[PDB]
Amino acid sequence: MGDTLTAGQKLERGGSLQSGNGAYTLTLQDDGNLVLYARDKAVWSTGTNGQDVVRAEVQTDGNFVLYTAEKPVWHTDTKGKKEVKLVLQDDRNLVLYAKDGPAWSLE
């Protein structure tokens, strides 16, 4: 745990920065907030708690930024289906075949 992020480096969930003397810790938490702690007492934060923040990156173009991960907005909900292939057939039916057979079709 060092005290510097160079252009290209990023803090991820859990990952943090420690000051030289080891008094101050800037830590990107899993709650989505980048907090600064002075001996177990939060003194500043980004105020992004309750958000899906995955990385806090010092970019090349020259700005520190916190990004949300890619959020799922629509899914067929067929987790764990083996060897899946989506096919658009000539019968105007979009189907999602699996190892056992059709897992999802709009029909």
Q: Which residue has the tokens 């745990």?
A: 1
Rounded distance between C-alpha atoms, residue 16 and residue 13, angstroms: 8
**Which partner in ligand MMA, a copy of itself, none is near 96 (CB below 5 to 8 A by kind)?**
a copy of itself
**Of ligand MMA, a copy of itself, none, which one sits near residue 13, judging by CB under 5 to 8 A according to partner kind?**
none
Residue numbers of the site for ligand MMA (CB under 6 A)? 29, 31, 33, 35, 42, 45, 49, 59, 61, 63, 65, 72, 75, 79, 89, 91, 93, 95, 102, 105, 107
Rounded to whole angstroms, the Cα distance separating 96 from 104 reads 5
Question: Beta strand pairing status for 102-105 and 53-58?
Answer: unpaired
CA distance 51 to 68: 7
Q: Which is nearer to ligand MMA, 2 or 70 (CB)?
A: 70
CA dist 96 and 94 (Å) reads 7
The one of ligand MMA, a copy of itself, none whose footprint includes residue 44, by CB under 5 to 8 A per kind, is a copy of itself
Q: Given the complex with ligand MMA, which of 22 and 31 has the nearer CB atom?
A: 31
